[PDB]
């Protein structure tokens, strides 16, 4: 079990001004730290955020958080469930800022809600330094869905924070799960009227302004003012990052298909939709060709790494826990015999990989 700590700096808050926080299970005598960013959509205007506050309040407030959580998947301390990092210090950072971990804006007389995701990460890191993180060798910033994009947006800022604080020996790395989106055309066009079916480019263009969102500096310098939304898209921000980042991404991610206004009904798939889905998977594969540490199975699914059965999927015969272990070996101070790190399916249709999650 991981135990809740609300941030001592109560200026760093969830959307409604309640303190943000983190859940921690220490492993003395491990110098590995895993800091995991939770996902769960976002809200990009007052109207949608008010609705989210009414029926998704745990994603906007710490008032009702439990005092513990059980670590699962990559956050499990059992080797059977987590062959990769079962002995690590484990941190789960709840997503309560609704901003894709990008915001640096407090609640004020001008702002109904605080969007502080980027500051929450920084504050968690600062407070953990006093609880053992100062002795770390590796800090893996991991996250799923909105938290996977959060890793891309924040890993280099964590690295720079630790450098500036006088901790150059902590190696900061990122693990971005289900956060690698395409700013593509919807299958059928919707106007951006609510959250889940707003087209990707429009959702981020609106959100970055509403959240006062911040993006990595090198990417900001490329796209410049008014175009920083581009830096939420993995294929554009990734080449600008300095920290090692391992990318986990289903080729047919259900959240990608949702923002693309595709709903698979179990009904027969007609030619236009078949072509749309095949081209989506091919585009995703193309964007990963030059990502050396990646795991991209040809499945229709959502979010892998904190599920208890995350061990089961394989690409080319290699599981994600194995690929992550191979990645660790590759970052010891040339490819490794039988220990691959670039694992992207080539087959063109969901579930062409037999190891895809069954949905059971
Ligand atoms: O948390 C979650 O379940 C998912 C839901 C969709 N989502 C997300 C995150 C980043 C970006 Cl860039 C985009 C998009 F649509 F603009 F591409 C969507 C995280
Ligand atoms: C709390 O966080 C804010 C924003 O990150 C910062 O300006 C302030 O100095 C912090 N407070 C303390 C006591 O460190």
Swiss-Prot record:
Q: What is its EC number?
A: 3.1.1.98
Organism source for this protein?
A: Homo sapiens
Gene encoding the protein? NOTUM
* Localization, UniProt: Secreted
Q: What does this protein do?
A: Carboxylesterase that acts as a key negative regulator of the Wnt signaling pathway by specifically mediating depalmitoleoylation of WNT proteins. Serine palmitoleoylation of WNT proteins is required for efficient binding to frizzled receptors.
Q: Where is the active site?
A: 145, 253, 302
Q: What is this protein's record name?
A: Palmitoleoyl-protein carboxylesterase NOTUM
Tissue expression per record: Rarely expressed in adult normal tissues.
On induction, the UniProt comment says: Up-regulated in hepatocellular carcinoma (HCC) with high intracellular beta-catenin.
């Amino acid at each position: 079990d991981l135990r809740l700590h609300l941030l001592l700096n109560t200026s760093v808050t969830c959307n409604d001004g309640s303190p943000a926080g983190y859940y921690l299970k220490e492993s003395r005598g491990s110098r590995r730290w895993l800091l995991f960013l939770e996902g769960g959509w976002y809200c990009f205007n007052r109207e949608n955020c008010d609705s989210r506050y009414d029926t998704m309040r745990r994603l906007m407030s710490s008032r009702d958080w439990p005092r513990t959580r059980t670590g699962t998947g990559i956050l499990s301390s059992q080797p059977e469930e987590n062959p990769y990092w079962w002995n690590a210090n484990m941190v789960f950072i709840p997503y309560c800022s609704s901003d894709v971990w990008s915001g640096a804006s407090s609640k004020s007389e001008k702002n109904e809600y605080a969007f502080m995701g980027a500051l929450i990460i920084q504050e968690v890191v600062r407070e953990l330094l006093g609880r053992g993180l100062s002795g770390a060798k590796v800090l893996l910033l991991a996250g799923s869905s909105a938290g996977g994009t959060g890793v891309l947006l924040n890993v280099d800022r964590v690295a720079e924070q630790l450098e500036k604080l006088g901790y150059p020996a902590i190696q900061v790395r990122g693990l971005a799960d289900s956060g690698w989106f395409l700013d593509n055309k919807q299958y059928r066009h919707t106007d951006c009227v609510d959250t889940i079916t707003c087209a990707p480019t429009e959702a981020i263009r609106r959100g970055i302004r509403y959240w006062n969102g911040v993006v990595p500096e090198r990417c900001r310098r490329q796209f410049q003012e008014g175009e920083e939304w581009n830096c939420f898209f993995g294929y554009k921000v990734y080449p600008t990052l300095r920290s090692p980042v391992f990318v986990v991404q289903w080729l047919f991610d259900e959240a990608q298909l949702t923002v693309d206004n595709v709903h698979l009904t179990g009904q027969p798939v007609q030619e236009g939709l078949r072509l749309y889905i095949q081209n989506l998977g091919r585009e995703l594969r193309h964007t990963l060709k030059d990502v050396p540490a990646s795991f991209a199975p040809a499945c229709l699914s959502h979010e892998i790494i904190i599920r208890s059965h995350w061990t089961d999927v394989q690409v080319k015969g290699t599981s994600l826990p194995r690929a992550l272990h191979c990645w660790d070996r590759s970052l010891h101070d040339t490819p490794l015999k039988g220990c691959p790190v670039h694992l992207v399916d080539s087959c063109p249709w969901p579930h062409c990989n037999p190891s895809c999650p069954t949905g059971t």
